[PDB]
């Protein structure tokens, strides 16, 4: 057999200008592949839309959580400032004797 020669058909070519062209497919074969590729791309798009929606929702939840945590910290510091303002007021009232 000439199988030792035929096995060179897909051997990577030396030239970058040698392009692989698959044998002709009838319209029936191409239609099944094209409708298959449409189904795949509509699914990739459906999942990507879901992912953009999930990311935006996560961005909103993280922002809300961060703001909640910040406000709790800010409140704690303002309450400590109020305590110190009161301590100084009491020290001044002590100084003037009531």
């Amino acid at each position: 057999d000439d199988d030792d020669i035929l096995e060179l058909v897909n051997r990577p070519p030396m030239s970058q200008m040698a392009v692989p062209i698959k044998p002709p497919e009838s319209q029936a074969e191409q239609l099944m592949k094209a409708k298959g590729e449409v189904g795949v791309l509509r699914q990739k798009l459906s999942m990507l839309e879901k992912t953009l929606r999930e990311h935006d929702d996560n961005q909103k939840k993280l922002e809300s959580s961060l703001k909640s945590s910040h406000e709790e910290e800010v409140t704690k510091l303002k309450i400590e400032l109020e305590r110190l303002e009161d301590e100084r007021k009491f020290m001044l009232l002590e100084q003037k004797h009531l």
Binding site: D2, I5, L6, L8, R11, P13, M17, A18, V19
Partner: protein, 124 residues
């Protein structure tokens, strides 16, 4: 149109020809009128040898329905020696049609492999 006479011998014996075996003008000697169909016989006017059509050349040869007598100019090719230096092949990746259904330049050419079996020391 004139063929590149004896160029098949040059491809496997001359280093600069072996390194870039393009621009040769050859006549289709025989075809299998899939994968086997890509293996054709070509003639240089002195010698005939196997050529394996691949890539755009395989697609072109098939759609154009090329056959015995057609004259082609090889554009992209690689030489190849297989089966312990016994079998010679020109891997053709691209070519152009020069002349359709021309009369055979040589009807009684020498098979390249038969020549190199008698002169094995000439090959690179």
């Amino acid at each position: 149109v004139q063929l590149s006479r004896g160029d098949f011998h040059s491809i496997f014996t001359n280093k600069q020809r072996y390194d870039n075996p393009t621009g040769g003008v050859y006549q289709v000697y025989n075809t299998r009128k899939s994968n086997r169909k890509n293996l054709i016989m070509i003639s240089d006017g002195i010698y005939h040898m196997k050529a394996l059509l691949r890539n755009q050349a395989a697609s072109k040869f098939q759609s154009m329905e090329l056959q015995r007598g057609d004259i082609i100019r090889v554009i992209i090719a690689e030489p190849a020696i297989v089966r312990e230096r016994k079998k010679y092949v020109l891997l053709v990746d691209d070519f152009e049609l020069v002349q359709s259904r021309a009369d055979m330049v040589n009807q009684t050419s020498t098979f390249l492999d038969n020549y190199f079996s008698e002169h094995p020391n000439e090959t690179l």
